[PDB]
């Protein structure tokens, strides 16, 4: 029954906006493969639906964080190339081979362990992308000799393929020399060995700000979904990105508080004079976190304050008398210049747009728009 | 049956602890039905597994927030009584009837609309619990005349059953007279009409701090899972609750930063002298939010600082030289007196324990423990 929902709170996900943003990247980098980053459930949009729609618009390569994410894509019909960006436990190597998923090599020791765990039951090629650390300081190979040795090991085993090499920028969304230094260091390492088929270093910020002619693939994530990685990037670039997400809830009913009556846990809001309130069927278990108290939402065109504590499943809003049961409320709006933009919500949460999206929980249905056609995913009813 | 998982980051969920906490409440209130609150996926633990286990230990009644949650329980074999605590859209009334789910009545107008939407295709009884507002100030009937009229409407339709009446405390977890006042107001209203089968007002805090002899059912949520609703409640009561959750990740690999090398986005941590770091395969898309930077985690017995920005899928920790790949890291510990307790994590997040648990995302497998038996749910592969 996963195409039905029974509470009027949901995310609208505009797949046409996503496809449009993908085309912007394709057009900016016409000689590169766009390796769409759909990790973390496509940043809360739903990786299965996003990846399927992107394949219909010409995507041929995805990146995810974990093998679970890659297998989830394979099980739901994705036949594109997939790279797992995290480090797979070596004992699970045969599953990556079986499912035709490319893996990240973080170190020489990982590769040696992976080789020891290949049983021979899965005989297909293992596709490998070697990760270089050029300044991010997480896992990755830092020295050129190690990079060369890993390639030489791969060359001694017919089953192992050196498919790609990559790095990742730490500060591409802010001004400074770090990004150019990382890119030059990447080239310096990659130029000391045979070149693989895929060479990639650019996230959304990198892809929006630099050509990087040396690379032949890019890895945009957040900007596919229609968000600039930072304000600095938005200010620097001319390309228009289309926000893909709205968060909507309908007023269940309105109620009148009299002077001296409080609302919600802790009695943290008390009416001074007759005040109309609206109850919304959404709360912090949906990802509309407690810190959202004091924000404004858009109730049928009116800017209305969230008052009292946000509850697990319910949120209270102070509203004008015209507001009635069934009115639509936009809590996250699909426009950057909006008091309900993802960025404004991120500022209220003292965080970044990425986290606002990731917070949106499994309890929210996703309602996908593709042209006239509409599709609903409700994870609870799987 | 049991799912596989391919990244070493997970939640341990101790079902024995949950059953033990349920028994504490049954023993505190031996003449009451314990209506176990398993809304929001049992506060992140997994409502299907929790509810099944509680039924095996004598639970006969659950409460959830939404009809989707109730149907999810029914589809996975739960045959207990279930009350939806939120307001169902009136158009969906036949689905509640079909699935034998009790509904909350918030107002006379809702009931009239619900009645208009009953088609006759589902002929089974519709079980109703009337919600009274005694101070919480959300939806609910606040006046006695309206309460009586709603009961009189229910009495005109053979299909409709007045099964229960309830209210909810705003401030039961803090000192003050509000809770006693609400309880007396509840009794004053309920005593003006015929009494239904179920009479309930106590959440975890209410159940721990008051007998409420007038009521014949209680609605504990967070304390079933082993957490006190507040520090005040913990300080006031002698009953020991057993925490049910650990959040675990294994070190993928360690690495040495030299002086002047930075880590993660924004280069927000720079080593002053040779520093060993560990990479953990968990991040803010898992619910370990960015604000956790600067916290301590427990790496194989050693207290270790989270350094640099927490990423979507990866977290960096500063570690002693003894730490190696594969070491277990406790990020949330199943002990209240711990620097990794849920309450300490909640303080770092500037929130409450409830939200820390709700934040734990669908990407984390839940590994259930029942004695020596172990069972895994991994939503990505479901
Ligand atoms: C998430 C991520 C991206 C996309 O970043 P945004 O465009 O959303 O800012 C690109 N590359 C990697 C690989 C790093 C590794 C391993 C990501 O993790
Ligand atoms: C969540 C909730 C509970 C349980 O609260 P805790 O024990 O976890 O503090 C009890 N009752 C209601 C009904 C309110 C309504 C409608 C809950 O929503
Ligand atoms: Cl990295
Ligand atoms: Na080879
Ligand atoms: Na190129
Ligand atoms: Na709460
Ligand atoms: Na009746
Ligand atoms: Na980030
Ligand atoms: Na979350």
From Swiss-Prot, chains A, B:
Keyword set, alphabetical order: Isomerase, Pyridoxal phosphate
KW Isomerase (keyword) present: yes
S-S bridge residues: none
Binding site for substrate: 138, 312
N6-(pyridoxal phosphate)lysine PTM positions: 39
Catalytic activity: L-alanine = D-alanine
GO BP: D-alanine biosynthetic process; peptidoglycan biosynthetic process
Enzyme Commission code: 5.1.1.1
Catalytic residues in the record: 39 (proton acceptor), 265 (proton acceptor)
CDD domains linked: PLPDE_III_AR
Top-level class of the enzyme under EC nomenclature: isomerase
Cellular component, GO annotation: cytosol
Involved pathway(s): Amino-acid biosynthesis; D-alanine biosynthesis; D-alanine from L-alanine: step 1/1
InterPro entries referenced in this protein's UniProt entry, alphabetically: Ala_racemase, Ala_racemase/Decarboxylase_C, Ala_racemase_C, Ala_racemase_N, Ala_racemase_pyridoxalP-BS, PLP-binding_barrel
A molecular-function term among this protein's GO annotations: pyridoxal phosphate binding
Tagged with keyword Isomerase: yes
PROSITE patterns: ALANINE_RACEMASE
One Pfam entry name: Ala_racemase_C
Cofactor: pyridoxal 5'-phosphate
Function (record text): Catalyzes the interconversion of L-alanine and D-alanine.
Assigned protein family: Belongs to the alanine racemase family.
Record's subunit section: Homodimer.
Protein name: Alanine racemase 1
Organism for this UniProt entry: Staphylococcus aureus (strain Mu50 / ATCC 700699)
Highest classification ranks of the organism: Bacteria, Bacillati, Bacillota, Bacilli, Bacillales
């Amino acid at each position: 029954f996963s195409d039905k929902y029974y509470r009027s709170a949901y995310m609208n996900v505009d797949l046409n906006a996503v496809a449009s943003n993908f085309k912007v990247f394709s057009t900016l980098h016409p000689n590169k493969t766009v390796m769409a980053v759909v990790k973390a459930n496509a940043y809360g949009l739903g990786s299965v639906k996003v990846a399927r729609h992107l394949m219909e618009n010409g995507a041929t390569f995805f990146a995810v964080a974990t093998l679970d994410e890659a297998i989830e894509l394979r099980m739901h019909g994705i036949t594109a190339k997939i790279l797992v960006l995290g480090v797979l436990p070596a004992k699970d190597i045969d599953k990556a081979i079986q499912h035709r998923v490319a893996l990240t090599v973080p170190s020489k020791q990982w590769l040696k362990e992976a080789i020891k765990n290949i049983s021979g039951e899965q005989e297909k090629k293992l596709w490998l992308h070697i990760k270089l650390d050029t300044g991010m300081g997480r896992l990755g190979i830092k020295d050129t000799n190690t990079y060369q040795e890993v390639i030489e090991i791969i060359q001694q085993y017919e089953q192992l393929v050196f498919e790609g090499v990559f790095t990742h920028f730490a500060c591409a969304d802010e001004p400074g020399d770090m990004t150019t230094e990382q890119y030059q260091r990447f080239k310096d390492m990659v130029n000391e060995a045979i070149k693989p088929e895929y060479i990639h270093c650019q996230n959304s910020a990198g892809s929006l700000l630099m050509d990087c002619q040396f690379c032949n693939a890019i890895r945009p994530g957040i900007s596919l979904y229609g968000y600039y990685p930072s304000e600095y990037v938005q200010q620097k670039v001319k390309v228009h990105l289309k926000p893909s997400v709205q968060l909507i809830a309908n007023v269940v009913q309105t109620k009148t508080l009299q002077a001296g009556e409080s609302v919600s846990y802790g009695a943290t809001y008390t009416a001074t004079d007759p005040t109309t309130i609206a109850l919304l069927p959404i709360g912090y278990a949906d990802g509309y976190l407690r810190i959202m108290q004091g924000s404004f939402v858009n109730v049928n065109g009116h800017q209305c304050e969230v008052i009292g504590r946000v509850c697990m499943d319910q949120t209270i809003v102070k509203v004008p008398d015209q507001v009635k049961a069934g009115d639509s409320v936009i809590l996250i709006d699909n426009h950057r210049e909006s008091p309900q933009s993802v960025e404004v919500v991120a500022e209220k949460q003292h965080t970044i747009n990425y986290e606002v999206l990731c917070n949106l929980s499994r309890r929210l249905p996703r309602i996908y728009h593709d042209g006239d056609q509409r599709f609903v995913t409700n994870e609870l009813l799987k």
